[PDB]
Design an enzyme around this catalytic site. Structure first.
Site, PDB file in Angstrom:
ATOM      1  N   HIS A   1       0.845  -1.217   0.000  1.00 14.37           N
ATOM      2  CA  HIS A   1       0.000   0.000   0.000  1.00 14.37           C
ATOM      3  C   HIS A   1       0.867   1.249   0.000  1.00 14.37           C
ATOM      4  O   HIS A   1       0.485   2.267  -0.557  1.00 14.37           O
ATOM      5  CB  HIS A   1      -0.922   0.038   1.222  1.00 14.37           C
ATOM      6  CG  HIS A   1      -1.755  -1.192   1.379  1.00 14.37           C
ATOM      7  ND1 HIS A   1      -2.725  -1.545   0.464  1.00 14.37           N
ATOM      8  CD2 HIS A   1      -1.770  -2.139   2.344  1.00 14.37           C
ATOM      9  CE1 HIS A   1      -3.313  -2.660   0.872  1.00 14.37           C
ATOM     10  NE2 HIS A   1      -2.744  -3.048   1.996  1.00 14.37           N
TER      11      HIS A   1
ATOM     12  N   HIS B   1       5.923   6.949   6.417  1.00  9.66           N
ATOM     13  CA  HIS B   1       5.597   6.545   5.081  1.00  9.66           C
ATOM     14  C   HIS B   1       5.062   7.728   4.325  1.00  9.66           C
ATOM     15  O   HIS B   1       4.879   8.814   4.888  1.00  9.66           O
ATOM     16  CB  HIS B   1       4.589   5.408   5.063  1.00  9.66           C
ATOM     17  CG  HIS B   1       3.286   5.811   5.655  1.00  9.66           C
ATOM     18  ND1 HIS B   1       3.013   5.695   7.001  1.00  9.66           N
ATOM     19  CD2 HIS B   1       2.206   6.405   5.092  1.00  9.66           C
ATOM     20  CE1 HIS B   1       1.798   6.174   7.235  1.00  9.66           C
ATOM     21  NE2 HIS B   1       1.296   6.613   6.094  1.00  9.66           N
TER      22      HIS B   1
ATOM     23  N   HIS C   1       2.280   9.038   0.928  1.00  8.43           N
ATOM     24  CA  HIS C   1       1.256   8.841  -0.087  1.00  8.43           C
ATOM     25  C   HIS C   1       1.572   9.747  -1.254  1.00  8.43           C
ATOM     26  O   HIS C   1       2.029  10.889  -1.034  1.00  8.43           O
ATOM     27  CB  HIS C   1      -0.134   9.181   0.444  1.00  8.43           C
ATOM     28  CG  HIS C   1      -0.463   8.477   1.717  1.00  8.43           C
ATOM     29  ND1 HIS C   1      -1.229   7.326   1.740  1.00  8.43           N
ATOM     30  CD2 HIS C   1      -0.075   8.699   3.004  1.00  8.43           C
ATOM     31  CE1 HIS C   1      -1.321   6.892   2.986  1.00  8.43           C
ATOM     32  NE2 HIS C   1      -0.619   7.695   3.771  1.00  8.43           N
TER      33      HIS C   1
ATOM     34  N   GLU D   1      -3.076  13.524   0.801  1.00 10.00           N
ATOM     35  CA  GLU D   1      -4.347  13.104   1.426  1.00 10.00           C
ATOM     36  C   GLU D   1      -5.091  14.321   1.983  1.00 10.00           C
ATOM     37  O   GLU D   1      -6.214  14.634   1.551  1.00 10.00           O
ATOM     38  CB  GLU D   1      -4.042  12.060   2.493  1.00 10.00           C
ATOM     39  CG  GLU D   1      -3.364  10.832   1.889  1.00 10.00           C
ATOM     40  CD  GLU D   1      -3.672   9.579   2.631  1.00 10.00           C
ATOM     41  OE1 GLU D   1      -3.340   9.499   3.826  1.00 10.00           O
ATOM     42  OE2 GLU D   1      -4.285   8.650   2.043  1.00 10.00           O
TER      43      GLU D   1
ATOM     44  N   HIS E   1       3.815  10.976   6.338  1.00 11.91           N
ATOM     45  CA  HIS E   1       3.215  10.697   7.634  1.00 11.91           C
ATOM     46  C   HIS E   1       4.205  10.073   8.554  1.00 11.91           C
ATOM     47  O   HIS E   1       4.690   8.972   8.293  1.00 11.91           O
ATOM     48  CB  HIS E   1       2.049   9.718   7.439  1.00 11.91           C
ATOM     49  CG  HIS E   1       0.887  10.358   6.753  1.00 11.91           C
ATOM     50  ND1 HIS E   1      -0.140   9.651   6.145  1.00 11.91           N
ATOM     51  CD2 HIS E   1       0.603  11.664   6.560  1.00 11.91           C
ATOM     52  CE1 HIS E   1      -1.012  10.496   5.640  1.00 11.91           C
ATOM     53  NE2 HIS E   1      -0.581  11.727   5.868  1.00 11.91           N
TER      54      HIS E   1
ATOM     55  N   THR F   1      -5.909   6.789   7.697  1.00 21.23           N
ATOM     56  CA  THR F   1      -6.452   7.093   6.373  1.00 21.23           C
ATOM     57  C   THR F   1      -6.508   5.868   5.462  1.00 21.23           C
ATOM     58  O   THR F   1      -6.870   6.014   4.319  1.00 21.23           O
ATOM     59  CB  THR F   1      -5.625   8.152   5.658  1.00 21.23           C
ATOM     60  OG1 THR F   1      -4.335   7.597   5.388  1.00 21.23           O
ATOM     61  CG2 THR F   1      -5.497   9.433   6.472  1.00 21.23           C
ATOM     62  N   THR F   2      -6.149   4.686   5.973  1.00 21.17           N
ATOM     63  CA  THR F   2      -6.400   3.417   5.301  1.00 21.17           C
ATOM     64  C   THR F   2      -7.144   2.515   6.266  1.00 21.17           C
ATOM     65  O   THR F   2      -7.097   2.695   7.477  1.00 21.17           O
ATOM     66  CB  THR F   2      -5.079   2.699   4.873  1.00 21.17           C
ATOM     67  OG1 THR F   2      -4.474   2.024   5.992  1.00 21.17           O
ATOM     68  CG2 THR F   2      -4.090   3.662   4.317  1.00 21.17           C
TER      69      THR F   2
HETATM   70  N1  LIG Z   1      -1.978   6.851   6.701  1.00 22.82           N
HETATM   71  S1  LIG Z   1      -1.940   6.784   8.310  1.00 22.82           S
HETATM   72  O1  LIG Z   1      -0.758   7.391   8.886  1.00 22.82           O
HETATM   73  O2  LIG Z   1      -3.203   7.271   8.873  1.00 22.82           O
HETATM   74  C1  LIG Z   1      -1.830   5.082   8.775  1.00 22.82           C
HETATM   75  C2  LIG Z   1      -0.893   4.623   9.705  1.00 22.82           C
HETATM   76  C3  LIG Z   1      -0.841   3.274  10.071  1.00 22.82           C
HETATM   77  C4  LIG Z   1      -1.742   2.377   9.482  1.00 22.82           C
HETATM   78  N2  LIG Z   1      -1.810   0.992   9.756  1.00 22.82           N
HETATM   79  C5  LIG Z   1      -0.977   0.283  10.644  1.00 22.82           C
HETATM   80  O3  LIG Z   1      -0.090   0.835  11.279  1.00 22.82           O
HETATM   81  C6  LIG Z   1      -1.256  -1.182  10.739  1.00 22.82           C
HETATM   82  C7  LIG Z   1      -2.036  -1.551  11.947  1.00 22.82           C
HETATM   83  C8  LIG Z   1      -3.282  -1.007  12.133  1.00 22.82           C
HETATM   84  C9  LIG Z   1      -4.024  -1.343  13.274  1.00 22.82           C
HETATM   85  C10 LIG Z   1      -3.443  -2.209  14.223  1.00 22.82           C
HETATM   86  C11 LIG Z   1      -2.160  -2.722  14.065  1.00 22.82           C
HETATM   87  C12 LIG Z   1      -1.450  -2.384  12.915  1.00 22.82           C
HETATM   88  C13 LIG Z   1      -2.655   2.824   8.542  1.00 22.82           C
HETATM   89  C14 LIG Z   1      -2.698   4.161   8.182  1.00 22.82           C
HETATM   90 ZN   LIG Z   2      -0.415   7.656   5.823  1.00 27.34          ZN
END
Ligand SMILES: NS(=O)(=O)c1ccc(NC(=O)Cc2ccccc2)cc1
Ligand SMILES: [Zn+2]
Length: 257
Positions: A61, A91, A93, A103, A116, A195-196
């Site tokens: 992703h 990471h 986007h 985003e 992010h 946001t995912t």
């Molecule tokens: N794009 S964002 O920064 O909002 C964002 C940051 C992190 C995640 N997902 C995880 O870190 C995986 C996870 C999720 C739930 C429980 C255990 C692991 C998705 C979006």
């Molecule tokens: Zn993100």
């Protein structure tokens, strides 16, 4: 499974993740004229001098640069936050074109990409517990525009060849995330979500006003990554952003006049 395509993209997510239509979803449009200065907000404290990066991972992703979060080594505090939030990963986007990819938007303007830096509240013990709390996470969002290169991004760009496809990782030690920050820490803040999927409503968003500039060659290298695994049909990892969601009953606060 969820993704960013026509048949599994953001308009579909609500069927597996009904919170997609929740009361505090992210990202949002930041209407600069409607955000209110909050003089009680404290300055942000970004303390990354002891950061320990470990690894870079293509998760299908985006790609994540992961950190050792088993001690207070790289932490975010102050601003709207109570307590200490540990950096776990960053990471990005990004778009297929320089005119889209962020985003969050600012007065409906889309940036080429968005960084992010994800942190969790140490009062909850680990990340998995933190994501179950309304104040569990703090994500520092930084816009990228295309112009001059960002020198501090180049070590990330140059390892991407080694993690082209989903499930590939590479050692990525001694990376200093301070090289990804703009000069100013002026920010907007509001309560939101991941946001995912799973779209959990656990994030205090802190979005910096000042973008960083990256070069055309830098963002072109992001666009050579793949969403697919090795040996599967090639689909370029581009346009891995969720569009702006309704603000609903929220006010965006600004740290600056
Ligand atoms: N794009 S964002 O920064 O909002 C964002 C940051 C992190 C995640 N997902 C995880 O870190 C995986 C996870 C999720 C739930 C429980 C255990 C692991 C998705 C979006
Ligand atoms: Zn993100």
């Amino acid at each position: 499974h969820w993704g960013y395509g026509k048949h599994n993209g953001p308009e579909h997510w609500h069927k597996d993740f009904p919170i997609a239509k929740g009361e505090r979803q992210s990202p949002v449009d930041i209407d600069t004229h409607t955000a209110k200065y909050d003089p009680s907000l404290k300055p942000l404290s970004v303390s990354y001098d002891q950061a320990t990066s470990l690894r870079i991972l293509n998760n299908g992703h985006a790609f994540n640069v992961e950190f050792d979060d088993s001690q207070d080594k790289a932490v975010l505090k102050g601003g709207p936050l109570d307590g200490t939030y540990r950096l776990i990963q960053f990471h990005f986007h990004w778009g297929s074109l320089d005119g889209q990819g962020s985003e969050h938007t600012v007065d409906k303007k889309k940036y080429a990409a968005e960084l992010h830096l994800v942190h969790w509240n140490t009062k909850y013990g680990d990340f998995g517990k933190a994501v179950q709390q309304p104040d569990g996470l703090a994500v520092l969002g930084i816009f990228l525009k295309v112009g001059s290169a960002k020198p501090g991004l180049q070590k990330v760009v140059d390892v991407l060849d080694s993690i082209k496809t989903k499930g590939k990782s590479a050692d990525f030690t001694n990376f200093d995330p301070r090289g990804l920050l703009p000069e100013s820490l002026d920010y907007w803040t509001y309560p939101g979500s991941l946001t995912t999927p799973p779209l959990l409503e656990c994030v205090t968003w802190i979005v910096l006003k000042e973008p960083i500039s990256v070069s055309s060659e830098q963002v072109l290298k992001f666009r050579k990554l793949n969403f697919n695994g090795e040996g599967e049909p090639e689909e370029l990892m581009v346009d891995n952003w969720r569009p702006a969601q309704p603000l609903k009953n929220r006010q965006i606060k600004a740290s600056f006049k």
